[PDB]
Design a protein around this ligand. Structure first.
Ligand SMILES: *[B]([O])([O])[C]([C][C]([C])[C])[N]C(=O)[C]([C]C1=[C][C]=[C][C]=[C]1)[N]C(=O)C1=[C]N=[C][C]=N1
Ligand SMILES: *[B]([O])([O])[C]([C][C]([C])[C])[N]C(=O)[C]([C]C1=[C][C]=[C][C]=[C]1)[N]C(=O)C1=[C]N=[C][C]=N1
Ligand SMILES: [Cl-]
Ligand SMILES: [Mg+2]
Ligand SMILES: [Mg+2]
Ligand SMILES: [Mg+2]
Ligand SMILES: [Mg+2]
Lengths: 204, 231, 196, 243, 241, 250, 244, 226
């Protein structure tokens, strides 16, 4: 009944020293029934990464919508959209459905190509922006992720340390949620290289 | 000349040529006569045929139990206007339980015709109407022209050669107005009036069309052997 | 809310309390419920603050535009514009408005417009939650053609009682005097009116 | 050239020839007048008796708007009726919103703006009427006259149609000879005389006199038609003055 | 030659209908003048009542748009009243939406933008009027802003409009060349009206009675028109010095 | 009371000419000279304040208009057409950009939107083209400084420097000789004043000339402090005094 | 009424031609020449700019060659403002197709859509047609490399090599002479520039007068790259082929 | 949320806390609740966060266009009127509760506006869940003729009352001062009385602690040449 917890799932993002990390679980279900263990929730438009939790039809629809909009942006502007600008585009797009919203919890992550500055942001379903320095959490295990992040996180972590922190934050939060888990992916993002890692986690 | 392309254009002398051309269609139409007394009102119409195989075009239309008209000019425009009158008569009945006054019926036709003379795209109505009726103030006869001008009269005629019947009625005025409580004598005076507008052709059984409305008489149309009495 | 408008010999006086409430919390204790729709046509507002402001703003607009075209509107005309809004939007509004104004021809006039959108021309009017407690008092003490000082005392004593008994009413007693002389604003504080 | 073929086109003069052509239709029509009196207004009109078959007193030309305003016009009669129908809608919406009946100056601008709107586009034709109208409001009596252009002013006396010059001359005498003012009953008599004098310009066909009036004393500030004895008294006065 | 009937460009880059609307402006044969004092803005206009049958009190080309804004029109009265009604509506709507009185210059811009639309859109004709807006604005002080059928508008130190505008314009130009200031250095509006009438008399070369003139005065927080007796008081003071 | 002009008033003639666009360009030719010059660290736009009367206050008529804090515009041709275009240009910068992306549009895209509005007047029903050519100068983070011309057709071209209107042929030749890719903003203002003196007949001073720059960020003109990223408008209109100072070193 | 001033843009002549389309084509014949040449391993788009001024900022300028998506580009001949209206519509159509099917739009489908829009202006609405002719250069996995042209009538056709705008008669003769089916991109580049060099109304063909582009399946690991040539790169390819 | 506005001698000051919450969870610890409508018109927001941002940006956008159209600096009453008419139209469904303050050519102003579209005038105002705690402080310490320094002090004390006593409010105090004839000064994190203490332990993991199945490079670049 509650659209935000039919399919389940989580996204978490963190900043480090000259880097960001964004991670998500792979589960898609119909309440108790697990259906897919390959349903990725992180997409990218150029160098800007977008994680989306919530109702899976809206996750897919918004991915297709932001691909559409960032493609046209690029043709007209003659450059890739930056994370700060994309954040505003996500907010605008969500708020224009104020009274019939997409049931989602988006998370933007990326490095501004000009300034080199690490950037993350989170949103509610109607487009309010939380632009955090430290970390952003989203999904059915958001309480669990908040607890893990708030204890495990420290600022200015190197990419390969930040990988361990975000992975342990996701995995342990997912294991305390019935509707999250079934695999996990972690993107480590630096100014001009991006490493993607699939995590081994318990499959229940 | 240059000012007759549409109804929205005045000529330099203040004339509306499209309205005057619509007026011309009435003069080409077949003659019809209207007249009344204090008790009854009568329409008499000379119907026209295409040839000997064809029927004679109907000239008289019933609008309500107490009101109807005869036409001269474009018959489809008479159908549009009579249908409008039927609806307005009907609205007066359903909403107010009130038979529509004949004077008010004229005012409604005037205003309907007028809108077509002031706006672009539309055209004036190409037909003249003689409305008879009996309401709360007795018998009435109206003449409608598609300029919008509506006129209450004791008698009149419109169509081709209508000036002959109109002169007769102008002489007979004092006689036929007094024909009260005698429908057959009032029709006789109407049939004698329309005879003044005839040339070559004469009034036959399927040529003539008569209608009457009065005090204890609903609007009824007489055609065929029903009018043989008056020939 | 406790509001009233009273006609007297020289014109009309409008009076009101100054309290706005969200449940039992007093959101505003110095509210001005006496509002100008024209130079000498004012209204008393009760009910929803948002609704009455929205209506009063629209009425002020309509009468400004009336004045540009046709000169000064009558108090009856102002009451009619209030009515038209309150009646036609009765399903979506909670507004109890008293309209009061001064012409030189008609002198002081008071019109009350309750929830339904009906209009009632009266010598004086009372409205708002606190008015229930002063129907008795106002009926016994009102006279026609009172002086300015008598009418100020009549409103002061009346709203004092309305305030005393109604929790939804309180704060200061504001008044607005409408005569040929002009527009006078009066204020009366708790220490003055509570001891009456 | 071609500037006169379409409405709303300025000629090189700065004129709208279509509006000037509408005036010709007005000049072609029958004579109608208005007289402002002490506490009201009087309207009168020439009705040409085309035929004996016309029913006397039936084809009424003067029209009432609300209960306090009279309207009369010369030119295309249907155009006048269209304008009065609009006038009635304007007066109704005014009374609906503001309660009071529409003031005469307020009413005058409602017609004026509507007539003027029919000189703004080529998709419509200007009005082929000059309309004389007025009545009694809270500020007293008001008489107006409104042309095809949308132009209107207040008047002491007004006249339009084929007999307008004759009428205007007679109205000008009344203004000079009665500076303190004219009574309502006097104005009815004078209105009859002026229509009779103005009938020399339409002298071929005989005519029918029609008068109406609003007066604060004589009609309680409501529009009424002059009927029966008071009409015949005005006709007799008019018949005596021409002889 | 249909480029002369509607508002499209001629080969010369001209809009003939706009130019012909400017000529309609002078059809009334009335001259208007506007000047600014310290505390006020005065506008005067010729009043011609040719017909004795006219009610002279209803013959006017000065309009009270809002409490603060007055408008004098040079052009035919139907277009003048069209413009007046719209300006009144616009001024009232502005107050409702934005919570303060519409400034004189902003109304002038708005009316000029509307006039521009008639020069670009074919179905609407230009109004054959020049609109002179006057006020004492709460920010800018005494203000004169004038609109025409082209959709042009600008602020003025003083201005004149009509058949004999150039004669009035040069008369005013020469005064401000002497005084070397943007206004009439005078405390009372009464003396600023006297200035306006005096300099119109000098420029036009005609004397005026009380019924030949029509006066509008803008002060802080109101605009009002003078009665015939208020003008007579002005004319007496001019003659006595 | 109908808009029946649902058909184009600009059509192709047998020769392939769009007559109304050509005639609009003729109206632009009659209009007063305006110009734009691009420097390395700025852009300058300038024009003559042709006063219709000496009683008129020419300060109230602004030929050079701010569109966004970093974009300015000037014109040659019909002033009323320009005024409504500026209103629409300011609004479209918000509706089709700032309300979506939370930042002002880059110069080229705002130009593209203005161009679109002018193209539509060249094809839509019942309208004539705009009788103006615009010069739009602006700055944005990723494109840097830029200067664009926009014609009645809707066509737009980027320029290093150009002129439009009355004496544009002569003025463009003057700019070809003086312009180089190493100009500082002060050098461009100097060249702008020299170029504009040729096309002006009468008085030549800060009161008869209107000149604005797209230059450095002006934090003093921002109106508030406390947000490090908001550094102030790059658009600045030069004062009457600031112009006269540079006319002494001319 | 308004009928008086209606040009009637969507009617037949007595001969059965569309007046406004024919006159729009006459407009296009004066525009700067644009050439498209299709090879086995890519497509070339070459086009001549119309407004030679030394003060025109060329590196930030775009009047001829526009990008529709990553796989499809167009060369314009005619009114640039008209072309930009259509280009933005075509860009949207491509993204609507991508959103719907999750596949890049096939070239012909995009071309047909634009051509159908142009057709509509010739049959209804009473508006003037778009005074634009396009050369579409594109790739998809069905037909591979494709060249099309569309004109104001809304008719479109496919080509191995084609010109639009000025001197097309002369340009098409020269292309028909030197084109062969086994030709490559580098050879097609040379043919495109040589054809413009001979047909141009200017005294000499220079880098500042040209816009140039290639679509190659000669990207890293079997992908398709759109290269819009920079001014310096056009200057280099002019020296390489031996024109300057 | 705790938001306040306090009038002083030559202007107006507004303040707010920096916590946003969903249920009992703190979503953001350093929220920015002071919104710029125009350079010298700012407002503090409470209620639904997306709504307050959207409503201030829309009115701020239209105020900017109005300011350009009229060649005048924007007025607080215009922002007030545009906000209330918009909120009234949406019948309370746009959950924006705002304290609107500023300076303009007319003077200094302080208003509140509620979600249903009612507005109020005052010398001191508070809104949000911590408004009762803030209003208690304001009712105890406010006086007429406050200086700038006294008004900032009073405003921040009123926010602190909300921070400490209301669970809906917390973290830091943001202030904006708008004085007549001066630039508005936005003081982000004016007070910071809630810094977290050092943790007892570091939770940095040894590298290789997490089990991995697959690694791959992600292509973020465009299609390459040659
Ligand atoms: B009064 O109590 O009726 C008063 C009149 C209003 C014009 C200030 N109404 C209110 O205070 C209403 C509640 C109410 C009380 C009693 C009867 C009807 C309604 N309050 C509000 O409208 C309100 C409260 N807090 C914020 C905004 N609006
Ligand atoms: B304050 O407490 O009023 C505050 C003001 C806001 C401008 C930051 N409100 C909130 O933080 C609201 C509370 C709320 C919760 C649920 C429904 C409506 C309002 N929170 C949010 O708007 C919120 C919470 N999580 C994510 C995004 N937005
Ligand atoms: Cl506007
Ligand atoms: Mg689990
Ligand atoms: Mg399980
Ligand atoms: Mg109490
Ligand atoms: Mg036009």
């Amino acid at each position: 009944s509650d659209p935000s917890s039919i399919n389940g799932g989580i996204v978490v993002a963190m900043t480090g020293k000259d880097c960001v990390a964004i991670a998500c679980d792979l589960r898609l279900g119909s309440q108790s029934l697990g259906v897919s263990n390959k349903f990725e929730k992180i997409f990218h438009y150029g160098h800007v990464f977008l994680g989306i939790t919530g109702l899976a039809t809206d996750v897919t629809t918004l991915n297709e919508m932001f691909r559409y909009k960032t493609n046209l942006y690029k043709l007209k502007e003659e450059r890739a959209i930056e994370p700060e600008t994309f954040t505003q585009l996500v907010s605008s797009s969500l708020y224009e459905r104020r009274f019939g919203p997409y049931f989602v919890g988006p998370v933007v992550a990326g490095i501004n190509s000009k300034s080199g500055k690490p950037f993350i942001a989170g949103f509610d379903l109607i487009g309010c922006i939380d632009e955090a320095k430290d970390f952003i959490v989203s999904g059915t295990a958001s309480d669990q992720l908040f607890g893990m992040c708030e204890s495990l996180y420290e600022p200015n972590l190197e990419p390969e340390d930040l990988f361990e922190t975000i992975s342990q934050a996701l995995l342990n939060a997912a294991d305390r949620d019935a509707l999250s888990g079934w695999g996990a992916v972690v993107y480590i993002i630096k100014k001009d290289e991006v490493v993607k890692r699939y995590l081994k986690m318990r499959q229940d | 000349n240059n000012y007759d392309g549409d109804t929205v254009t005045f000529s330099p002398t203040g004339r509306l040529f499209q309205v005057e051309y619509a007026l011309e269609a009435i003069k080409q139409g077949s003659v019809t006569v209207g007249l009344r007394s204090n008790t009854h009102a009568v329409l008499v119409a000379l119907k026209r045929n295409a040839d000997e195989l064809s029927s004679y075009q109907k000239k008289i239309i019933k609008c309500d139990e107490h009101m109807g008209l005869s036409l001269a000019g474009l018959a489809p425009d008479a159908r549009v206007l009579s249908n409008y009158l039927r609806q307005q008569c009907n609205y007066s009945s359903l909403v107010f339980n009130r038979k529509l006054a004949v004077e008010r019926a004229g005012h409604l036709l005037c205003d309907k015709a007028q809108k077509n003379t002031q706006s672009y795209g539309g055209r004036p109505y190409g037909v003249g109407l003689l409305i008879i009726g009996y309401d709360k103030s007795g018998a009435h006869l109206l003449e409608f022209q598609p300029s919008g001008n509506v006129t209450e009269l004791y008698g009149t005629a419109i169509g081709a050669r209508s000036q002959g019947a109109k002169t007769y009625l102008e002489r007979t005025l004092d006689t036929f107005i007094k024909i009260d409580g005698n429908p057959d004598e009032l029709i006789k005076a109407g049939v004698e009036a329309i005879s003044q507008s005839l040339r070559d052709e004469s009034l036959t059984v399927d040529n003539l069309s008569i209608a009457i409305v009065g005090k204890d008489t609903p609007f009824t149309i007489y055609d065929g052997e029903a009018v043989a009495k008056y020939i | 809310t406790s509001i009233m408008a009273v006609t007297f010999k020289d014109g009309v006086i409008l009076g009101a309390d100054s309290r706005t409430t969200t449940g039992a919390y007093i959101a505003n204790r110095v509210t001005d419920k006496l509002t100008r729709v024209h130079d000498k046509i004012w209204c008393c507002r009760s009910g929803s603050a948002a609704d009455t402001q929205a209506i009063a703003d629209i009425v002020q607009y309509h009468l400004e535009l009336y004045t540009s075209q046709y000169g000064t509107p009558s108090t009856e005309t102002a009451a009619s514009v209030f009515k038209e809004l309150c009646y036609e939007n009765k399903d979506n509004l909670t507004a109890g408005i008293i309209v009061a104004g001064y012409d030189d021809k008609n002198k002081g006039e008071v019109y009350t417009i309750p929830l339904g959108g009906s209009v009632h021309k009266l010598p004086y009017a009372i409205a708002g939650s606190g008015s229930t407690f002063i129907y008795g008092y106002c009926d016994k003490n009102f006279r026609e053609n009172m002086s300015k000082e008598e009418t100020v005392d009549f409103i002061k004593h009346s709203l004092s009682q309305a305030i005393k008994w109604d929790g939804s009413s309180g704060g200061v007693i504001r008044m607005v005097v409408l005569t040929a002389a002009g527009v006078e604003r009066l204020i009366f504080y708790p220490d003055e009116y509570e001891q009456l | 050239t071609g500037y006169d073929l379409s409405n709303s086109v300025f000629s090189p003069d700065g004129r709208n020839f279509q509006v000037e052509y509408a005036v010709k239709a007005v000049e072609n029509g029958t004579t109608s007048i208005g007289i402002k009196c002490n506490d009201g207004v009087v309207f009168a009109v020439e009705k040409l008796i085309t035929s004996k078959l016309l029913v006397p007193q039936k084809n009424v030309k003067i029209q009432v708007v609300d209960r306090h305003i009279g309207c009369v016009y010369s030119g295309l009669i249907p155009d006048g009726r269209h304008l009065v129908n609009r006038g009635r809608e304007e007066a109704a919406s005014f009374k609906k919103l503001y309660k009071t009946p529409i003031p005469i100056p307020a009413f005058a601008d409602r017609l004026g703006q509507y007539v003027q709107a029919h000189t703004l586009y080529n998709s419509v034709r200007p009005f082929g009427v000059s309309t004389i109208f007025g009545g009694v409001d809270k500020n007293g009596a008001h008489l107006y006259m409104l042309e095809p252009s949308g132009s209107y002013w207040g008047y002491k006396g007004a006249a339009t149609g084929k007999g307008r010059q004759s009428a205007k001359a007679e109205l000008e005498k009344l203004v000079d000879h009665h500076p303190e003012g004219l009574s309502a009953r006097e104005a009815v008599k004078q209105a009859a005389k002026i229509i009779y004098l103005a009938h020399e310009d339409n002298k071929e066909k005989d005519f029918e006199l029609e008068i109406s009036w609003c007066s604060l004393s004589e009609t309680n500030g409501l529009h009424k038609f002059v009927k029966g004895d008071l009409l015949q008294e005005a006709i007799d006065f008019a018949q005596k003055e021409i002889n | 030659g249909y480029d002369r009937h509607i508002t499209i460009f001629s080969p010369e880059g001209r809009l003939y209908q706009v130019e012909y609307a400017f000529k309609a402006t002078n059809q009334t044969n009335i001259n208007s003048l506007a000047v600014r004092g310290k505390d006020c803005t005065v506008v005067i206009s010729q009043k011609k009542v040719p017909d004795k049958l006219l009610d002279p009190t209803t013959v006017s080309y000065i309009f009270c748009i809002s409490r603060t804004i007055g408008m004098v029109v040079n052009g035919p009265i139907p277009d003048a009243r069209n413009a007046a009604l719209r300006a009144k509506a616009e001024a009232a709507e502005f107050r409702y939406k934005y919570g303060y009185d519409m400034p004189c210059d902003v109304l002038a811009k708005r009316m000029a933008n509307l006039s521009q639309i008639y020069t670009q859109r074919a179905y609407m004709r230009p109004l054959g009027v020049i609109l002179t807006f006057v006020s004492v604005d709460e920010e800018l002080g005494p203000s004169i802003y004038k609109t025409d059928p082209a959709g042009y508008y600008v602020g003025y130190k003083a201005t004149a409009t009509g058949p004999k505008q150039q004669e009035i314009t040069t008369n005013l130009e020469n005064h401000f060349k002497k005084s070397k200031i943007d206004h009439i250095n005078e405390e009372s509006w009464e003396k600023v009206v006297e200035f306006a009438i005096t300099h119109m008399i000098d420029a036009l070369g005609t004397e005026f009675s009380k019924n030949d003139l029509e006066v509008g005065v803008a002060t802080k927080d109101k605009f009002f028109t003078l009665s015939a007796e208020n003008i007579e008081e002005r004319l007496v003071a001019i003659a006595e010095q | 009371m109908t808009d029946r002009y649902s058909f184009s008033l600009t059509t192709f003639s047998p020769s392939g000419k769009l007559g109304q666009i050509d005639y609009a360009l003729t109206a632009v030719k009659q209009g007063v000279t305006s110009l734009g010059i691009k420097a390395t660290n700025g852009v300058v736009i300038a024009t003559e304040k042709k006063s219709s009367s000496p009683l008129a206050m020419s300060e109230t008529l602004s030929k050079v208009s701010l569109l966004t804090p970093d974009i300015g515009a000037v014109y040659s041709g019909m002033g009323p057409d320009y005024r409504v275009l500026v209103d629409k240009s300011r609004k479209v910068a918000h509706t089709s950009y700032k309300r979506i992306y939370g930042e002002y549009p880059p110069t080229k895209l705002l130009v593209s939107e203005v161009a679109k509005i002018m193209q539509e007047a060249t094809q839509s029903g019942g309208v004539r083209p705009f009788g103006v050519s615009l010069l739009i100068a602006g700055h944005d983070e990723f494109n840097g400084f830029s200067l664009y011309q926009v014609d009645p057709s809707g066509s737009y071209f980027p320029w290093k420097a150009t002129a439009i209107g009355k004496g544009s042929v002569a003025a463009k030749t003057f700019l070809e000789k003086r312009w180089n890719d190493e100009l500082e903003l002060e050098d461009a203002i100097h060249i702008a004043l020299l170029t504009l003196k040729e096309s002006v007949e009468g008085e030549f001073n800060g009161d008869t000339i209107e000149l604005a720059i797209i230059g450095d960020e002006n934090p003093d003109l921002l109106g508030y402090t406390g947000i490090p990223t908001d550094k102030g408008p790059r658009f600045r209109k030069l004062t009457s005094q600031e112009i006269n100072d540079r006319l002494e070193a001319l | 009424g308004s009928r008086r001033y209606d040009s009637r843009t969507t009617i037949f002549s007595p001969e059965g031609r569309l007046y406004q389309v024919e006159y729009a084509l006459e407009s296009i014949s004066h525009a700067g020449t644009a050439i498209g040449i299709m090879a086995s391993d890519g497509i070339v788009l070459a086009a001549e700019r119309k407004v030679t001024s030394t003060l025109l900022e060329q590196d930030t300028s775009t009047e001829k060659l526009y990008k529709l998506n990553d796989k499809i580009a167009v060369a314009v001949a005619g009114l640039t403002a008209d072309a930009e209206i259509l280009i933005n519509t075509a860009r949207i159509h491509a993204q609507n197709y991508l959103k719907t099917y999750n596949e890049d739009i096939p070239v012909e489908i995009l071309v047909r859509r634009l051509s159908d829009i142009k057709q509509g202006y010739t049959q209804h609405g009473g508006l003037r047609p778009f005074g634009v002719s396009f050369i579409y250069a594109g790739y998809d996995d069905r037909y591979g490399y494709q060249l099309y042209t569309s004109n104001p009538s809304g008719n479109y056709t496919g080509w191995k090599a084609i010109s639009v705008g000025a001197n097309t008669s002369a340009a098409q003769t020269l292309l028909q002479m030197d084109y062969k089916d086994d030709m490559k991109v580098d050879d097609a580049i040379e043919l495109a520039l040589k054809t413009l060099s001979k047909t141009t109304d200017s005294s000499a063909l220079t880098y500042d007068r040209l816009e140039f582009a290639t679509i190659r399946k000669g990207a890293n690991d079997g992908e398709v790259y759109q290269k819009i040539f920079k001014p310096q790169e056009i200057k280099d390819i002019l020296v390489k082929t031996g024109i300057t | 949320t705790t938001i306040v506005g306090v009038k002083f001698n030559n202007g107006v000051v507004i303040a707010a806390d920096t916590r946003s919450t969903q249920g009992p969870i703190v979503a953001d610890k350093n929220c920015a609740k002071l919104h710029r409508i125009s350079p010298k018109i700012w407002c503090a927001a409470a209620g639904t966060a997306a709504d307050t941002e959207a409503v201030t940006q829309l009115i701020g956008s239209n105020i900017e266009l109005h300011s350009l159209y009229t060649s005048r600096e924007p007025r607080v009453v215009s922002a007030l009127q545009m906000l209330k008419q918009h909120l009234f139209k949406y019948q309370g469904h746009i959950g924006a509760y705002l304290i609107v303050a500023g300076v303009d050519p007319t003077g200094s102003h302080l208003f509140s506006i509620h979600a249903h579209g009612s507005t109020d005038v005052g010398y001191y105002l508070s809104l949000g869940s911590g408004s009762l705690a803030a209003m208690a402080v304001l009712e105890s310490h406010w006086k007429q003729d406050l200086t700038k320094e006294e008004a900032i002090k009073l405003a921040s004390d009123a926010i602190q009352a909300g921070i400490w006593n209301d669970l809906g409010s917390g973290s830091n105090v943001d202030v904006c001062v708008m004085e007549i004839g001066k630039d508005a000064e936005y003081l982000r994190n004016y007070l910071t009385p809630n810094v977290r203490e050092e943790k007892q332990k570091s939770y940095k993991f040894p590298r290789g602690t997490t089990a991995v199945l697959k690694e791959s490079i992600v292509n973020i670049c465009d299609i390459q040449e040659e």
